[PDB]
Design a protein around this ligand. Structure first.
Ligand SMILES: [Cl-]
Ligand SMILES: [Cl-]
Ligand SMILES: [Cl-]
Lengths: 52, 536, 47, 31, 294
């Protein structure tokens, strides 16, 4: 329902902003923080988040 | 003399075309397929004036009379044998037709017979009729056996027979056995060839589709597609419509997707209760799933037959290429040009350029026939045309009944909690078929194969309901919540972990199918008003 | 080759067979086009 | 097609000939 | 979702500022290089999955060949059947073909997701990476399946090669289900090149490989006395001599085999085969004339 982009415009930019925030956070922490366990700061489903 | 001459040349044909590796393998196994003894019939076949009791007897003419009758009887038997068997036997038919072709060729070295195509068209009843016996038996078997009894496997690209209780059997008039000379030539050859084609009886796939394509031609395919469309129109607007209308009422008026917090076990319990009447509906599989599988198998047949046709056309065009001036790209060494050598190679194959040569040396009648022939050879469907889109577009027009889409949404946008669109009923049906069954029970995929899901997904796509289905589906929601909480309980005898594993499998399948349908089905949108002040 | 073409390109083969069945330097061009479609020729052009 | 089958089963079969006589003698050694 | 990565390359220019133009082109070139690499790798993986499916289907096609029926013939003259693999009991049982099929469809969704993308004013077309790799791979597999070895004088039976080529084509045709590509034109491109003595890249073809083998292996052993033409069988056949032949001549020269060869070589290829046959007759003729003059 592409018409919803009218009334729900804010949610689009909210969603983009929130997801963007999480990606840049993960990026810097994966690169800079020692792991407690092997799966720490590894998100195998990150592509799904970027795709949407 | 005529009897043994025909039998001799049939056995020769059967031997010539018998796989050499199989021959040697049988020899090593101590079961040598014994090669027929050679004979000397030619001098008898060359006798045009036997002088007997003052008469001049044309022995050649007399032999031909009988040999021609034997050829026709062979062809009648081959087609009649097909008519007494299921669709998988068409491969066997094709082999037998090829042996008959070889027989005619061997006999034509000494005798004058009607053209093989003429003989075949007559036996096929395709001289004074537009569709032959082979084409008509194919549709007969599609309608009575293939559509109702076969299960598509999308990973192997093969169809197989359904489970016993769904196997719709019908009595076949098994043909009386004629003499070996009218089949493959001898008992040994008959046994050898029936073993060879035994492999092809347990499935329907690319080889069967390849054969069907050749034997039906463009006209046979067209009529079968047109008739499959009529079967689908009849099923969708008839019994399926009837059961959809029935089940839409039995369906819960409203069904909300419960929030994550309730947990996956509780959500499973919720769906069980809410969809109990769809679950317990006695004829859901025997009638509803059955009729949908038939729709799916019909639409699959069209897709797969188009693909076989495309493979057939491309191969034809490759062999046409040298007589049609068409050359592949050539390798260019340093100091050479692409245009320089391509023109030079065009010179080499100029004596093979058919139409120009006939235009140079042929009669106005020859030229006109060649020009028409050339146009028929180069212009194939694979060149720039496709069919599956047209098939789908036309099935959409069979869904004009108001209960496919339901009433206008309360919110002016879309239905959410309401169960008034087909996709919602499909979601209830999906709930049923995702439920795990006992270890010794047959599953939906064992009984109906992929065709069921092709049909259900096709309806959703053609109604433009696939996005709302993706969002609102019950099973997808359960899977989503279970992924989050990772809980595993046996709710109403349904082990949740096993249930959500199956949901994922059908989700994968649905997404592939929906994506394919959307791809082949290759503007202004509904806009909404911003709030308005009382001022104006 | 002949049997494969007659099955793949019958409309072209038909025209070729007619054209062959109906000079001595000009007749070689008919034969080269014929032998390319697997038609047996009295005189072999490639030879 | 249904009527087309009936016009081949019922419409099917609707002699001191040497060939005929020889055929019958051979046809027994198979059926 | 792999198409997200090349799409992200379009963002790279947003990081630049008018006060540091020194870095702009470096970042630009980085976005192009990465986009190209992502799309190439996505195409290579689809290519790899397709090859694996082809191999699986060639095996299924092989299982249909007459040679496998010998046991059935022999046991009938004394006193795992195709299709069983397709009989699915439960979708939770995951076959190799299931895995390959799913992985292929998932990735083709990404390759077909967008017709093209614009990265730093350059236009990238994902499907064209797939088309190109399929052409090259199909060529590669055809020559591979010919199983040609100079040293041992071995080559595939034409009928078996043709069977495998057909299975490949069936799988490749199915790609049109997933991606807006014309597979017919890749068939054209690859197969018509195979009819020539060398392809567009100057490499040997099935035509040149078979032409060489029939002359240098089969017909040479006829001269050596180990094989004879059998008009009765319409084939060349191994003679019962004291020899060390590694092949059965009838399995390369009978009607079905020669028909299979013609399917693959076509008029171009068969014409080339004959020209090579004629060269060897020329040499024999030149030698005969010498004996006539003598
Ligand atoms: Cl993490
Ligand atoms: Cl007399
Ligand atoms: Cl049969």
């Amino acid at each position: 329902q592409p018409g919803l982009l009218g009334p729900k415009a804010l949610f689009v930019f909210m969603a983009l902003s929130f997801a963007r925030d999480e990606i840049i956070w993960l990026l810097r922490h994966a690169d800079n923080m020692p792991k407690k366990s092997a799966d720490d700061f590894i998100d195998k489903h990150i592509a799904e988040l970027i795709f949407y | 003399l005529a009897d043994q001459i025909f039998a001799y040349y049939k056995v020769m044909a059967g031997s010539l075309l018998l796989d050499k590796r199989l021959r040697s393998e049988c020899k090593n196994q101590g079961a040598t397929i014994h090669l027929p003894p050679s004979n000397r019939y030619e001098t008898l076949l060359k006798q045009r004036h036997v002088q007997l009791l003052g008469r001049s007897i044309d022995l050649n003419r007399l032999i031909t009379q009988r040999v021609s009758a034997a050829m026709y009887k062979s062809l009648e038997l081959a087609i009649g044998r097909f008519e007494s068997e299921d669709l998988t036997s068409i491969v066997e038919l094709d082999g037998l037709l090829e042996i008959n072709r070889m027989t005619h060729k061997l006999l034509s070295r000494y005798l004058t017979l009607d053209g093989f195509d003429a003989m075949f068209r007559e036996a096929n009843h395709n001289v004074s009729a537009p569709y032959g016996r082979i084409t008509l038996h194919v549709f007969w078997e599609l309608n009575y056996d293939f559509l109702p009894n076969y299960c598509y496997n999308g990973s192997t690209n093969r169809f197989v027979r359904t489970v016993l209780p769904f196997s719709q059997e019908f009595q076949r008039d098994k043909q009386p056995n004629a003499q070996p000379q009218y089949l493959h030539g001898s008992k040994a050859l008959n046994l050898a060839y029936s073993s060879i084609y035994g492999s092809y009886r347990n499935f329907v796939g690319p080889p069967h589709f390849q054969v069907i394509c050749r034997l039906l031609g463009y006209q046979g395919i067209a009529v079968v597609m047109e008739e499959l469309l009529k079967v689908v129109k009849s099923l969708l607007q008839g019994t399926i419509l009837q059961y959809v209308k029935t089940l839409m009422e039995v369906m819960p008026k409203i069904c909300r997707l419960p929030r994550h917090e309730y947990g996956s076990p509780g959500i499973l319990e919720f769906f069980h209760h809410q969809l109990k009447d769809i679950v317990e509906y006695a004829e859901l599989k025997t009638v509803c799933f059955q009729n949908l599988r038939e729709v799916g198998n019909a639409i699959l047949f069209c897709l797969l037959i188009e693909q076989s046709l495309s493979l057939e056309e491309v191969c034809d065009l490759l062999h046409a290429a040298p007589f049609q001036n068409i050359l592949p790209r050539v390798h260019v060494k340093e100091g050479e040009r692409l245009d320089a050598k391509m023109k030079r190679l065009e010179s080499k194959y100029a004596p093979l350029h058919l139409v120009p040569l006939i235009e140079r040396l042929g009669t106005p009648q020859q030229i006109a026939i060649a020009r028409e022939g050339d146009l028929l050879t180069k212009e194939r469907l694979c060149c720039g045309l496709s069919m599956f889109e047209v098939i789908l577009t036309r099935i959409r027009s069979f869904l004009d009944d108001p209960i496919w889409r339901g009433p206008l949404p309360s919110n002016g946008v879309m239905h959410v909690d309401e169960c008034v669109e087909f996709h919602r009923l499909w979601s209830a049906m999906q709930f049923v078929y995702c439920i795990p069954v006992g270890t010794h029970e047959f599953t939906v995929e064992q009984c109906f194969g992929d065709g069921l899901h092709w049909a259900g997904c096709m309806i959703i796509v053609l109604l433009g309901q696939q996005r709302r289905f993706a969002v609102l589906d019950f099973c997808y929601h359960l899977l989503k919540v279970q992924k989050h909480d990772g809980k595993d309980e046996i709710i109403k005898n349904v082990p949740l972990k096993k249930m959500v594993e199956r949901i994922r499998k059908f989700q994968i399948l649905n997404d592939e199918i929906i994506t394919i349908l959307d791809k082949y089905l290759k503007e202004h949108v509904r806009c909404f008003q911003p709030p308005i002040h009382q001022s104006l | 080759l002949r049997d494969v073409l007659s099955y793949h390109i019958p409309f072209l083969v038909s025209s070729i067979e007619d054209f062959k069945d109906h000079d001595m330097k000009v007749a070689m061009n008919v034969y080269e086009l014929s032998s390319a479609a697997g038609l047996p020729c009295e005189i072999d052009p490639a030879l | 097609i249904r009527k087309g089958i009936q016009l081949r089963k019922v419409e099917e079969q609707r002699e001191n000939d040497v060939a005929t006589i020889l055929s019958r003698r051979i046809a027994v050694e198979y059926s | 979702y792999s198409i997200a990565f090349p799409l992200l390359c379009t963002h790279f220019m947003s990081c630049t500022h008018e006060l540091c133009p020194e870095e702009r082109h470096h970042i630009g070139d980085r976005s192009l290089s990465l986009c190209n690499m992502f799309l190439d790798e996505m195409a290579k993986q689809a290519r790899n999955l397709i090859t694996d499916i082809c191999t699986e289907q060639c095996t299924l096609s092989d299982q249909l060949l007459p040679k496998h029926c010998a046991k059935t013939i022999s046991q009938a003259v004394n006193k795992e059947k195709p299709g069983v693999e397709s009989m699915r009991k439960n979708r939770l049982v995951v076959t190799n073909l299931d895995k390959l099929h799913t992985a292929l469809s998932e990735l083709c969704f990404s390759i077909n997701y967008v017709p093209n993308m614009v990265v730093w004013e350059h236009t990238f077309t994902p499907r064209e990476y797939l088309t190109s790799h399929l052409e090259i791979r199909f060529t590669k597999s055809i020559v591979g399946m010919t199983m040609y070895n100079q040293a041992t004088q071995e080559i595939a039976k034409p009928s078996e090669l043709l069977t495998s080529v057909r299975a490949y084509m069936t799988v490749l045709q199915s790609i049109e289900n997933y991606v807006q590509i014309d597979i017919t034109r890749v068939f054209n491109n690859v197969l018509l090149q195979q009819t020539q003595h060398l392809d567009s890249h100057g490499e040997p073809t099935i035509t040149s490989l078979y032409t060489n083998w029939y002359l240098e292996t089969l017909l040479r052993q006829v001269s050596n006395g180990h094989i004879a033409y059998f008009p009765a069988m319409k084939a060349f056949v191994n003679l019962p001599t004291e020899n060390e032949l590694t092949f059965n001549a009838e399995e390369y020269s009978d009607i079905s085999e020669m028909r299979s060869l013609s399917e693959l070589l076509g008029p171009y290829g068969m014409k080339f085969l004959s020209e090579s046959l004629m060269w060897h007759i020329s040499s024999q003729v030149a030698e005969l004339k010498k004996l006539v003059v003598e």
